[PDB]
Every structure is written in C-alpha cells, then in structure tokens.
Amino acid sequence: SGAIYVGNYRVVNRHLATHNDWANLVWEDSSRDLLVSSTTAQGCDTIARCDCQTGVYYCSSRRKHYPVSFSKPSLIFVEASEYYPARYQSHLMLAVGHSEPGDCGGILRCQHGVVGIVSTGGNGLVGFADVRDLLWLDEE
Numbered sequence: 001s002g003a004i005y006v007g008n009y010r011v012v013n014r015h016l017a018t019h020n021d022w023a024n025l026v027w028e029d030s031s032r033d034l035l036v037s038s039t040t041a042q043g044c045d046t047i048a049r050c051d052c053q054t055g056v057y058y059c060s061s062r063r064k065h066y067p068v069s070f071s072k073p074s075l076i077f078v079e080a081s082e083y084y085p086a087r088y089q090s091h092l093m094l095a096v097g098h099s100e101p102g103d104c105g106g107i108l109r110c111q112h113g114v115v116g117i118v119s120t121g122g123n124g125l126v127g128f129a130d131v132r133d134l135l136w137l138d139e140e
C-alpha cells in the first residue's frame, strides 16, 4: 500500500483504489495501473520533473529503502504470478530488487522528488509506474 499526496491529488495504484477514490476521481489509466483522486487537504510531496535513472525505493516487505538504477518508462510485458495474471503495462520502469504484491504504492524518489510508485514484481525485479510525465499534478 501507499500513495503520493501532491497538491490536492492522491495518486494510487489503480487496482488498489478505494470506493472514495473512484467517487472523487480526477484521472485513471488501466494500461498504466494508475488512478488519481481529489483530496480535501493539500499534500506535501513534490513530483520529480527529470530523466533520472537512479533513485531510492521503499520496500515494505523488507521495512527498507534500497538504492536502485531503473530503466526509462516503457511498454513491458509483465509475467503471470501466483497472485496476478500476465498483462502489458505502459509507462513502467524496471529495476533489480525485491518486491511482493503488498509492496505496491511504495515511493521511488530521486534528487528531484517522487518519480513513481511500486506496481509490478517477482523474478528478482521491481517495476514502478512513472508519474513524471503527469505535469498537471503541479497545477490547479
């Protein structure tokens, strides 16, 4: 679990969005595993606006943050697992690292701010849904 709180927006994995998120929806995209809902209180997170490929992510299944190198956002075939079927996911970045389903929502950050959230994994990889291209998160 986990979310990004930027301005009056809450960014979560689409497959973990609550009824309140869907009832206060701003934007959603099934191909990216992302959903953004509106919030009453303003949040403190800053979104990175950059092309970094190194950063740090939070892994809840280890209670640890790890430094990683990650690929630029791409359309990737995500393999099937014990818990979720195979599917194509766009705007996804991959790194070598540990992740389990409950790690979804952990933040990946670079020197410029939040880059994305954990969205895929297994087989020794962790995948993050990018948010750096959603420039509208910074306005209104």
Ligand SMILES: Cc1ccc2c(cnn2C)c1Nc1ccn([C@H]2CCNC2=O)n1
Binding pocket: 015, 016, 081, 082, 083, 084, 099, 100, 101, 102, 103, 104, 118, 119, 120, 121, 122
């Ligand atoms: C982050 C990560 C890591 C390992 C992962 C997955 C999925 N199967 N494995 C081995 C994963 N992502 C997803 C995407 C959809 N989910 C469902 C599955 C049960 N709870 C969820 O949130 N998990």
Ligand SMILES: [Zn+2]
Binding pocket: 048, 049, 050, 051, 052, 110, 111, 112, 113
């Ligand atoms: Zn950066």
